[PDB]
Amino acid sequence: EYELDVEALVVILRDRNIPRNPLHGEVIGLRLTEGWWGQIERFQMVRLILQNDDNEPLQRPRYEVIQRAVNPHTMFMISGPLAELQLAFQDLDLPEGPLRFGPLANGHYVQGDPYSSSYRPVTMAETAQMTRDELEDVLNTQSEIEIQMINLLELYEVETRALRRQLAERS
Amino acid sequence: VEEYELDVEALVVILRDRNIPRNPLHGEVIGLRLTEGWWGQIERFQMVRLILQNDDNEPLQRPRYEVIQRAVNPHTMFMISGPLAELQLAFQDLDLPEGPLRFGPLANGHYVQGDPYSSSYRPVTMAETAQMTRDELEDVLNTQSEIEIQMINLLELYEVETRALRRQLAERS
């Protein structure tokens, strides 16, 4: 649990033409368009803590990291650079292992899908920061991704060959 | 500096099976393409050096071989491809090299469109990652990430080319 600046959060909401007031217990899916890891999208999931067990507003509100990957259907979503989002979510960082991939957290790479299109592997800055088990999980997941990319590359070659043949036959 | 047993007669059968008539010499280094093994039916690479004699140029009753910590290259001169089980007949306890060395020509992430080694490349399997040290994992992941960056770039290029070709077709109805 880290510190939450709710007035910064509201500015972030308004800048994005989101009118809803953030509520206690709400979960938010974050798309971080860039950060310390580089200029590539990553994902994080947080839960607002605005009140205490007695249902009274906190003087110093907080948020917590949720250990589930952000999904394409994730309802409440915010995109922005790490530096901007940290205005609301103090110390915000990437989640463990392949969770940071969001919709690709389980290696499902889909042709034509915007998220698959935007996916980018972990950088060297990221891997220096990982534990052994994180590295295994990330590596396992990127490997699954590569297997689909490879399969897609083969299909592209066959199709490209066929198209070129069709084009000669019709020229 | 670990050395392992070598069955030269078995090596020579391996060679004859492949129409290679040369006899193995002390100090020769061999590039191995393991077509399949305990990691699965995908190709991996390993490099070894024959030890047939002692420091006094006398033939060993028990020849050995050692692993060379360098990646097999496409130009590697003396090459042998076979499944691990077969190659283990000659090289006792043959196993994959450390981290991305096992990719041979791709050990440094150089993924090239149309290149046969690039086309045959396959990422590490879960059987492989479970065995690896942290630093191995890091190196391998860093390498595979460079590969995917090249694959991503290539996918884009296919999609553009595909588009183009389909238009030219369409306009020929």
Experimental approach: X-ray
Resolution (A): 2.4
Phi, psi angle pair for A94, to nearest 5°: -70, 155
Closest residue by Cα to residue A44 from A78, A84, A107, A94: A94
Greatest distance between any 2 Cα atoms in chain B: 78
Residues on chain A bordering chain B, Cβ-to-Cβ distance under 8 angstroms: 119-124, 127-128, 130-132, 135-136, 138-140, 142-143, 145-147, 149-150, 152-153, 156-157, 159-160, 163-164, 166-167, 170-171
Closest residue by Cα to residue B109 from B68, B136, B82, B141: B141
Closest residue by Cα to residue B127 from B15, B13, B38, B24: B38
* Separation in Å, CA of B150 to nearest CA in chain A: 11
Q: Report the sign of the C-alpha dihedral through residues A73, A79, A82, A87, in that order.
A: negative
Contacts of B32 (CB under 8 A, 6+ apart): B45, B46, B47, B48, B72, B79, B80, B81, B87, B91, B94
Domain interval for residue A161? 131-171
**Do B18 and B95 share a structural domain?**
yes
**Contact between residue B162 and residue A163 where contact means Cβ atoms under 8 Å apart:** yes
**Do A144 and A119 share a structural domain?**
no
**Do B145 and B111 share a structural domain?**
no
Q: Report the sign of the C-alpha dihedral through residues B77, B78, B83, B84, in that order.
A: negative
User: How many folded domains does chain B comprise?
Assistant: 2
Strand, helix or coil for residue B48: strand
**Do B154 and B73 share a structural domain?**
no
Q: Do A120 and B166 touch (CB under 8 A)?
A: no
Q: Which residue has the tokens 């409440």?
A: A76
**Contact between residue B46 and residue B58 where contact means Cβ atoms under 8 Å apart:** no
Contacts of B147 in chain A (CB under 8 A): 146
**Do A103 and A80 share a structural domain?**
yes
Residue of B137, B144, B162 to mutate, interface with A, max A Cβ within 10 Å: B137
Secondary structure letter of residue B69 according to DSSP: S
The structure tokens listed for A134 are: 């994180």
**Contact between residue A48 and residue A24 where contact means Cβ atoms under 8 Å apart:** yes
Contacts of B161 in chain A (CB under 8 A): 160
Rounded to the nearest 10 degrees, the angle between the axes of helix B134-170 and helix A132-169 is 20
**Do B108 and B170 share a structural domain?**
no
Strand A42-51 to B29-34 pairing = unpaired
Region of A131 on the Ramachandran plot (φ > 0 left; ψ -120 to 50 alpha; else beta): beta
Phi, psi angle pair for B104, to nearest 5°: 55, -115
Report d(CA B123, CA A54) in Å as an integer.
53
Q: Which residue has the tokens 């024959």?
A: B50
**Do B121 and B41 share a structural domain?**
yes
Alpha carbons within 13 angstroms on the beta-carbon side of residue B123 total 28
**Contact between residue A78 and residue A46 where contact means Cβ atoms under 8 Å apart:** no
* Separation in Å, CA of A45 to nearest CA in chain B: 24
Q: Which residue has the tokens 């860039």?
A: A34
Q: Report the sign of the C-alpha dihedral through residues B94, B132, A145, B105, in that order.
A: negative
**Do B169 and B111 share a structural domain?**
no
Q: Do B142 and A127 touch (CB under 8 A)?
A: yes
Report d(CA B124, CA B42) in Å as an integer.
9
Region of B145 on the Ramachandran plot (φ > 0 left; ψ -120 to 50 alpha; else beta): alpha
Closest residue by Cα to residue B33 from B105, B100, B123: B105
Strand B44-53 to B29-34 pairing = antiparallel
**Do A12 and A81 share a structural domain?**
yes
Contacts of A153 in chain B (CB under 8 A): 151, 154-155, 158
Q: Which residue has the tokens 């989002």?
A: A85
Q: Quick one: B8 exposed, middle or buried, by C-beta within 10 A (0-12, 13-18, 19+)?
A: middle
Report d(CA B44, CA B96) in Å as an integer.
7
Q: Do B142 and A124 touch (CB under 8 A)?
A: yes
Secondary structure letter of residue B102 according to DSSP: G
- Shortest CB distance from A167 goes to which of B124, B144, B169? B169
Q: Report the sign of the C-alpha dihedral through residues A48, A52, A58, A61, in that order.
A: negative
Q: Which residue has the tokens 């003396």?
A: B78
The structure tokens listed for A161 are: 């060959």
Strand, helix or coil for residue B83: coil
**Do B163 and B85 share a structural domain?**
no
Please count the residue pairs, one from chain A and one from chain B, whose beta carbons lie less than 8 angstroms apart.
94
Residue of A131, A140, A152 to mutate, interface with B, max B Cβ within 10 Å: A140
CA distances from B131 to A151, B165, B170 (A): 26, 46, 52
CATH number, domain of A144, equals 1.20.5.1500
Q: Scanning every residue of chain A, which has its alpha carbon at the shortest distance from the alpha carbon of B154? A: A153
* Separation in Å, CA of B43 to nearest CA in chain A: 14
Closest residue by Cα to residue B24 from B76, B63, B58: B63
**Do B106 and B55 share a structural domain?**
yes
Q: Scanning every residue of chain A, which has its alpha carbon at the shortest distance from the alpha carbon of B126? A: A140
**Do A17 and A55 share a structural domain?**
yes
**Amino acid, single-letter form, for residue A54:** D
The structure tokens listed for B69 are: 């910590």
Helix H, strand E, coil C: the string for chain A is: CEEECHHHHHHHHHHCCCCCCCCCCCEEEEEECCECCECCCEEEEEEEEEECCCCCEEEEEEEEECCCCCCCCCCCEEEECHHHHCCCECCCCCCCHHHHHHHHCCCCCCCCCHHHHHCCCCCHHHHCCCCHHHHHHHHHHHHHHHHHHHHHHHHHHHHHHHHHHHHHHCC
